[PDB]
Motif scaffolding. Structure first.
Motif, PDB file in Angstrom:
ATOM      1  N   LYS A  85     -12.714 -19.875  -9.553  1.00  0.00           N
ATOM      2  CA  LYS A  85     -12.615 -19.965  -8.104  1.00  0.00           C
ATOM      3  C   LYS A  85     -13.807 -20.667  -7.470  1.00  0.00           C
ATOM      4  O   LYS A  85     -13.748 -20.992  -6.279  1.00  0.00           O
TER       5      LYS A  85
ATOM      6  N   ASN B 111     -13.317 -24.281  -6.026  1.00  0.00           N
ATOM      7  CA  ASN B 111     -12.596 -24.397  -4.768  1.00  0.00           C
ATOM      8  C   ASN B 111     -13.467 -24.120  -3.554  1.00  0.00           C
ATOM      9  O   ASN B 111     -12.999 -24.298  -2.425  1.00  0.00           O
TER      10      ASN B 111
ATOM     11  N   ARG C  41      -7.695  -2.456   1.354  1.00  0.00           N
ATOM     12  CA  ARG C  41      -7.152  -1.201   0.844  1.00  0.00           C
ATOM     13  C   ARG C  41      -8.248  -0.237   0.417  1.00  0.00           C
ATOM     14  O   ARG C  41      -8.101   0.981   0.572  1.00  0.00           O
TER      15      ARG C  41
ATOM     16  N   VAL D 130       7.890   1.872   8.145  1.00  0.00           N
ATOM     17  CA  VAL D 130       6.566   1.371   7.790  1.00  0.00           C
ATOM     18  C   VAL D 130       6.665  -0.011   7.143  1.00  0.00           C
ATOM     19  O   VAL D 130       5.850  -0.894   7.433  1.00  0.00           O
TER      20      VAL D 130
ATOM     21  N   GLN E 146      -1.528  -0.668   8.335  1.00  0.00           N
ATOM     22  CA  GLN E 146      -1.058  -2.032   8.108  1.00  0.00           C
ATOM     23  C   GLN E 146      -1.480  -2.964   9.240  1.00  0.00           C
ATOM     24  O   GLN E 146      -1.774  -4.143   9.004  1.00  0.00           O
TER      25      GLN E 146
ATOM     26  N   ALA F 155       5.713 -10.078   0.860  1.00  0.00           N
ATOM     27  CA  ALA F 155       5.050 -10.760  -0.247  1.00  0.00           C
ATOM     28  C   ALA F 155       5.167 -12.271  -0.117  1.00  0.00           C
ATOM     29  O   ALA F 155       4.237 -13.004  -0.467  1.00  0.00           O
TER      30      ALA F 155
ATOM     31  N   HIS G  90       9.606  -5.588   1.554  1.00  0.00           N
ATOM     32  CA  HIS G  90       8.517  -5.838   0.614  1.00  0.00           C
ATOM     33  C   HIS G  90       8.539  -7.276   0.113  1.00  0.00           C
ATOM     34  O   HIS G  90       7.492  -7.925   0.023  1.00  0.00           O
TER      35      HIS G  90
ATOM     36  N   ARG H  41      -4.932  -3.781   8.694  1.00  0.00           N
ATOM     37  CA  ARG H  41      -4.989  -4.669   7.540  1.00  0.00           C
ATOM     38  C   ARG H  41      -4.717  -6.112   7.939  1.00  0.00           C
ATOM     39  O   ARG H  41      -5.427  -7.026   7.506  1.00  0.00           O
TER      40      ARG H  41
ATOM     41  N   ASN I 196      11.965  -9.807  -6.878  1.00  0.00           N
ATOM     42  CA  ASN I 196      10.789 -10.285  -7.596  1.00  0.00           C
ATOM     43  C   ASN I 196      10.976 -11.724  -8.055  1.00  0.00           C
ATOM     44  O   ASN I 196      10.038 -12.531  -7.999  1.00  0.00           O
TER      45      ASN I 196
ATOM     46  N   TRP J  57       0.825  -1.201   0.000  1.00  0.00           N
ATOM     47  CA  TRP J  57       0.000   0.000   0.000  1.00  0.00           C
ATOM     48  C   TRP J  57       0.859   1.251   0.000  1.00  0.00           C
ATOM     49  O   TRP J  57       0.568   2.211  -0.709  1.00  0.00           O
TER      50      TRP J  57
ATOM     51  N   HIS K  98      -5.729 -21.739  -3.395  1.00  0.00           N
ATOM     52  CA  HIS K  98      -4.933 -20.568  -3.762  1.00  0.00           C
ATOM     53  C   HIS K  98      -5.458 -19.339  -3.021  1.00  0.00           C
ATOM     54  O   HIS K  98      -6.011 -18.401  -3.596  1.00  0.00           O
ATOM     55  N   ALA K  99      -5.263 -19.361  -1.706  1.00  0.00           N
ATOM     56  CA  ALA K  99      -5.672 -18.264  -0.842  1.00  0.00           C
ATOM     57  C   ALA K  99      -4.517 -17.279  -0.712  1.00  0.00           C
ATOM     58  O   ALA K  99      -3.428 -17.647  -0.261  1.00  0.00           O
TER      59      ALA K  99
END
Lengths: 27, 116, 886
Positions: free
Chosen positions: B70, B73, C752, C460, C501, C424, C420, C504, C383, A6, C698-699
């Motif tokens: 989806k 699932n 978000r 942050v 965050q 991820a 980051h 979140r 990445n 974000w 696939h969560a």
């Protein structure tokens, strides 16, 4: 590089969030 | 006939790469649909067969995308149709099959069987 | 007025002075932007053509600049013949400059005059003129007309060929003259003839500029005319391996990059093999880096599956993985990672560790230097290791461990990127979060004030990875983080982002403390109410964490306390709603959470009202009021599911994550409704084969994983307790009423769209018809609307069709139910409806604006505009009707 970071990719600054940044930054 | 050779080559490239992941299969089908559309926009006498095969690959792409949703699932009570994609996909494949069967002059039984 | 402004800048072009006349000419594009009306654009273009015909060459150049700047408006003039004729009249001027300016006009107008034969003849004649500016303008006009007309292209191909092999033509004009053949993408034989000419041309003129321009126009022809691509690729590879000049090799590299970006599926295995062989035996890093960039572009596509043991690509990737150049190392690591995650053969198990250790070596090389070029390779490596962790799960532990070991010994600007990367990775594999908490917390401790500019971003990001890593709450680490922010950062924006965050990731006590620390830092009272509402929401979600297990009394206490705080929060949140950017999604989401928590409390009250309030004096039925109570509870939970669905349909601007969160809440209340139905109301009719095909779960988030785990557990309990008991059961109430606890034990995540507004879009919906219409006539709703994309127009979704639903309700029912799917073509749509009003009186009509995206999902986003229609009767018709009735 998180795709859902974000704080990152802050090029799309909103209106409320920009004003909030301007108000809570210089304080 | 370079255009006919390319159409055959793209079709056999689709056929011979049917062992990939769903994302790769979708990417290959999208690439070949784009190539067939542009080939139809370039060679006028191959335009009909180009968009015929493009509609067939669009049917297969819609089937692949619907089968990788989806909603498989989640359980049946937790299924929600307000974010559904496969229900529109089946209707689109029906419309494309009818369009394939009836707006093309040169069809025969050997194509009607795959259409059905 | 539009015509008034047109006359205002029209009077200036007979001023006689050249300055005011060029003033008048160059004001025209602003007029075209303000007033896009075809009958007015037509008159403006006709008088621009007239002043072009009579003016001097500088005025003609001003008209040319206006025409170039107004290319999209000159398709709507429709008096094409006389306009083009009065421009074309000064192709016959003896001035070569005027002829050049007219050729540039014709090339600028080539979109609206294709197959215009006198223009083609003028370009062909001017290509053989003796004046350089006229020939250059003729080349420009030929390049434009060849793109818009194939009949021009077929003859001009032969002409350009004959004046390229004509040696009277100088080399620089040849260089300008080659890229005409780029627009030969009309006919297959035309493209073949162009390719034969280019093949003769490259070997005929082996100059470096000639081979650059000819190879680039050959590849543009091959990309546009698609039946040229394998031979073009093999020609480029041949010129890359054989031509010794560095510039030719560099064009071959960037050109194969273009062809791999456009059509990677048409690359054969031989082409990839030849490119790899080129990358092996080159001595220059500047060429090897480009070749590896092409191969890394190819690696992320399906060309690898066409390419496929240990091959030349694998050996090349291993060799370039350990290279002193950081860019070559990054490209080799990218190729290795793409090969590893592409398939699951036995050969890649050896190079998996090679990819891991090359990633670690690139991290230890790219972290301590802080170069601007080092950060790009660092981003590429991080990445790549995110992709490696997500695509193949088992080896993620070593990736996380080497990130943690690199974090303590790296510069600050590199630490944001590794935070980051670690966040991820940790949102996809939750078992790695708790093992790395101590080292990350020590890294947070050892910051202090040892930075001045990257300190905020590092704080942050590192607090973010603390919140992602810690699946549970914080006891002393929260106090240490609070002390670190209080001592270090007085910037309240960092505190707000860290609390954002925290809310979140579900760490709501931390968010509550940070929002308490922020209430005195704002200026506007609107943000004060917003922050106070956020504080109350975080406090209420923290109060929801007191549910230990199976204790329905403590459940009622915690839900009541959470409800008290949470709609104190919505009391303070609707005070923060503004006319500009209202808090609509936040208010709806919080109201739905209030309704869900209240329904949970009512259902626990019904759990207690099983044992309390015993059954009636009756000899389903004979269960008391509890049957109707679960009926009402099922109705309320199904209504909650429908309201979560309509919030989903009304959002349209959220992420995938926020939409998934809304879907999770909807599935939660749907689960509770189904658990009521399948084992209280009708176990016989319900409980079908509802076996969810739980395959690849696939969560994307840990919260989603917890929600689906809870859903699976509750569904299995419901299926295992389907008909084992009578419908008035203590096990039924216990399992359902503990399913409530299992659903509420996982903390709520604020996504978000709750905090940041991205892809701000709406429908203006400026309809045009209390209005009054005669009874016999039918009202015509000329409804039109313009969409308003904010910043990024298609960041998450794009509008495909605007589905307008209009209905009329008499006696301000729903008899004029109409629907029209209109497509906006320039971000604007217009359609016209026909509404019938036979019943006299006030008719309230309403219009909706549903949006169908590219995937076919309907989003109910547009305003519900209402206008009232009165059906007044004609006095003659009223008299006739009363005479016929009486």
């Amino acid at each position: 590089x998180x795709x859902x970071x974000w704080x990152x990719x802050x090029x799309x600054x909103x209106x409320x969030x920009x004003x909030x940044x301007x108000x809570x930054x210089x304080x | 006939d370079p255009s006919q050779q390319f159409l055959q080559q793209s079709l056999e490239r689709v056929y011979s790469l049917q062992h990939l992941d769903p994302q790769g299969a979708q990417e290959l089908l999208e690439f070949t649909i784009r190539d067939l559309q542009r080939l139809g926009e370039l060679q006028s006498e191959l335009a009909g067969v180009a968009d015929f095969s493009a509609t067939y690959l669009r049917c297969q792409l819609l089937l692949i995308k619907a089968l990788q949703e989806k909603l498989w699932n989640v359980a049946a009570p937790l299924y929600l149709k307000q974010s559904d994609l496969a229900s529109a996909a089946a209707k689109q494949i029906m419309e494309e099959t009818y369009k394939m069967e009836f707006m093309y002059s040169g069809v025969e039984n050997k194509q009607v069987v795959i259409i059905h | 007025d539009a015509n008034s402004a047109l006359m205002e800048l029209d009077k200036g072009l007979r001023s006689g002075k050249l300055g005011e006349q060029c003033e008048a000419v160059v004001r025209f594009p602003r007029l075209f932007q303000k007033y896009p009306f075809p009958i007015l654009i037509n008159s403006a273009f006709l008088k621009l053509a007239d002043v072009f015909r009579v003016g001097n060459n500088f005025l003609r150049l001003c008209v040319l600049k206006v025409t170039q700047q107004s290319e999209k408006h000159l398709e709507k003039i429709l008096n094409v013949d006389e306009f083009v004729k009065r421009i074309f009249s000064v192709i016959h001027s003896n001035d070569p400059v005027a002829r050049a300016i007219t050729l540039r006009m014709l090339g600028s107008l080539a979109s609206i005059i294709p197959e215009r034969k006198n223009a083609h003849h003028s370009i062909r004649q001017s290509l053989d003129s003796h004046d350089n500016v006229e020939v250059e303008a003729a080349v420009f006009a030929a390049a434009n007309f060849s793109a818009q007309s194939k009949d021009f292209a077929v003859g001009i191909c032969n002409k350009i060929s004959e004046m390229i092999q004509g040696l009277a033509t100088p080399v620089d004009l040849k260089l300008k003259l080659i890229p005409i053949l780029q627009h030969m993408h009309h006919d297959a034989i035309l493209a073949s003839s162009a390719r034969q000419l280019l093949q003769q041309l490259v070997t005929s003129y082996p100059s470096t500029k000639m081979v650059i321009v000819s190879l680039h126009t050959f590849t543009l022809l091959a990309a546009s005319s698609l039946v040229d691509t394998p031979k073009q690729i093999q020609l480029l590879l041949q010129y890359l391996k054989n031509d010794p000049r560095k510039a030719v090799k560099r064009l071959a590299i960037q050109d194969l990059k273009l062809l791999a970006n456009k059509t990677p599926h048409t690359w054969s295995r031989e082409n990839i093999q030849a490119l790899c062989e080129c990358a092996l035996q080159t001595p220059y890093d500047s060429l090897k880096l480009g070749m590896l960039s092409v191969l890394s572009t190819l690696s992320g596509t399906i060309a690898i599956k066409h390419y496929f043991r240990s091959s030349d690509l694998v050996k090349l990737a291993q060799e370039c993985c350990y290279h002193n150049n950081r860019g070559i190392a990054a490209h080799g690591v990218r190729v290795l990672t793409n090969i590893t995650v592409s398939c699951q053969e036995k050969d890649l198990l050896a190079l998996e560790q090679d990819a891991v250790f090359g990633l670690e070596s690139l991290l230890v090389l790219c972290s301590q230097d802080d170069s601007p070029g080092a950060q790009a390779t660092l981003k590429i490596a991080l990445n790549c290791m995110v992709k490696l962790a997500k695509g193949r799960p088992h080896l993620s532990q070593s990736v996380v461990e080497t990130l943690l070991t690199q974090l303590h010994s790296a510069q600050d600007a590199a630490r944001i990127l590794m935070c980051h990367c670690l966040a991820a990775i940790a949102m996809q594999l939750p078992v790695l979060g708790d093992g790395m908490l101590g080292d990350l917390m020590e890294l947070y401790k050892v910051i202090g004030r040892s930075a001045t500019d990257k300190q905020q971003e590092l704080l942050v990001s590192l607090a973010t990875v603390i919140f992602v890593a810690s699946q549970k709450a914080l006891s002393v680490e929260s106090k240490a983080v609070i002390k670190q922010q209080l001592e270090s950062v007085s910037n309240g924006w960092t505190v707000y982002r860290i609390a954002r965050q925290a809310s979140r990731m579900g760490n709501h006590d931390m968010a509550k403390e940070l929002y308490q620390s922020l209430l005195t830092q704002v200026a506007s009272e609107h943000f004060y109410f917003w922050l106070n509402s956020l504080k109350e929401f975080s406090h209420a979600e923290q109060c929801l964490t007191g549910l230990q297990e199976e204790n329905y009394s403590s459940a009622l206490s915690c839900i009541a306390e959470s409800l008290k705080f949470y709609h104190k929060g919505i009391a303070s949140l609707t005070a923060a709603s503004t006319p500009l950017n209202p808090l609509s999604f936040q208010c709806e989401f919080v109201k739905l959470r209030i309704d869900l928590l209240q329904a949970f409390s009512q259902l626990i009250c019904t759990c207690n009202s099983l044992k309390t309030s015993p059954p009636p004096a009756i000899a389903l039925q004979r269960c008391g009021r509890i049957s109707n109570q679960m009926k009402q509870s099922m109705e309320e939970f199904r209504s909650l599911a429908s309201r979560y669905g309509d919030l989903y349909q009304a959002s349209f601007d959220a992420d995938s994550a926020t939409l998934r969160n809304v879907e999770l809440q909807q599935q939660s209340c749907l689960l509770i409704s189904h658990a009521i139905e399948a084992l209280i109301l009708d176990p016989e009719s319900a409980s079908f084969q509802e076996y969810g095909s739980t395959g690849t779960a696939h969560a994307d988030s840990e919260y989603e994983r917890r929600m689906m785990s809870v859903y699976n557990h509750v569904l299995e309990e419901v299926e295992s307790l389907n008909r084992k008991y009578t419908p008035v059961s203590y096990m039924h109430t216990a399992c359902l009423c503990n399913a409530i606890i299992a659903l509420l034990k996982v903390p709520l995540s604020f996504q978000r769209y709750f905090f940041q507004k991205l892809q701000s879009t709406s429908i203006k919906l400026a309809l045009s018809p209390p209005i009054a219409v005669q009874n016999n006539q039918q009202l015509a709703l000329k409804v039109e609307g313009v969409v308003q994309h904010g910043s990024k127009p298609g960041l998450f979704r794009k509008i495909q069709s605007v589905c307008l639903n209009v209905s009329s309700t008499l006696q301000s029912n729903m008899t004029n139910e109409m629907e029209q799917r209109v497509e906006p073509h320039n971000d604007y749509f217009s359609t016209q409806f026909l509404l019938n009003f036979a019943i006299l009186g006030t008719h309230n009509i309403t219009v909706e604006s549903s949006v169908k995206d590219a995937n076919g999902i309907v989003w109910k986003t547009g305003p519900r505009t209402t206008i009232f229609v009165k059906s007044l009767e004609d006095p003659y018709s009223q008299q006739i009707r009363l005479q016929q009735q009486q």
